[PDB]
Amino acid sequence: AQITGRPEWIWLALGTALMGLGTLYFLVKGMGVPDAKKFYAITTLVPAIAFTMYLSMLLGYGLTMVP
């Protein structure tokens, strides 16, 4: 909780953590078990991408810096 001042930033961090957590479980389940492989990988990296997007915005290193 770096930016505790704004609850929106906290909500963002929470959202990113939620997505990251979900992606983590998806990866664990993915490993635990032609284009279907890519589709499945993406489906498993759904939370991974969500987290990356939320991080790029939270930190503002992939959003603020570049679109």
UniProtKB/Swiss-Prot annotation:
Cytoplasmic compartment segments: 29-40
Residues of the full protein shown: 15 to 83 of 262
TM region(s), chain numbering: 9-28, 41-59
Membrane topology (Extracellular): 1-8
Subunit-structure text: Homotrimer.
Protein family per UniProt: Belongs to the archaeal/bacterial/fungal opsin family.
Biological role stated in the UniProt entry: Light-driven proton pump.
Full protein name: Bacteriorhodopsin
Lineage, uppermost ranks: Archaea, Methanobacteriati, Methanobacteriota, Stenosarchaea group, Halobacteria
Protein source organism: Halobacterium salinarum (strain ATCC 700922 / JCM 11081 / NRC-1) (Halobacterium halobium)
Subcellular location per the Swiss-Prot or TrEMBL entry: Cell membrane
Entry comment on modification after translation: The covalent binding of retinal to the apoprotein, bacterioopsin, generates bacteriorhodopsin.
